[PDB]
Amino acid sequence: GIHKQKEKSRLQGGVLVNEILNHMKRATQIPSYKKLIMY
């Protein structure tokens, strides 16, 4: 249950993560996840 969901905070990593991820995380272009639900 908890395993599935992880903490996007408090976690650490090698700068590499900063260089490789440096770009962005997930689809920041978040348009509308639920709002859509209702058409």
Swiss-Prot record:
It comes from the Eukaryota. (Microbial infection) Forms amyloid beta-sheet fibrils in semen. These fibrils, termed SEVI (semen-derived enhancer of viral infection) capture HIV virions, attach them to target cells and enhance infection. SEVI amyloid fibrils are degraded by polyphenol epigallocatechin-3-gallate (EGCG), a constituent of green tea. Target cell attachment and enhancement of HIV infection is inhibited by surfen. Also similarly boosts XMRV (xenotropic murine leukemia virus-related virus) infection. This is PAPf39. It comes from Homo sapiens (Human). The gene is ACP3. The chain holds residues 248 to 286 of 386 of the full protein.
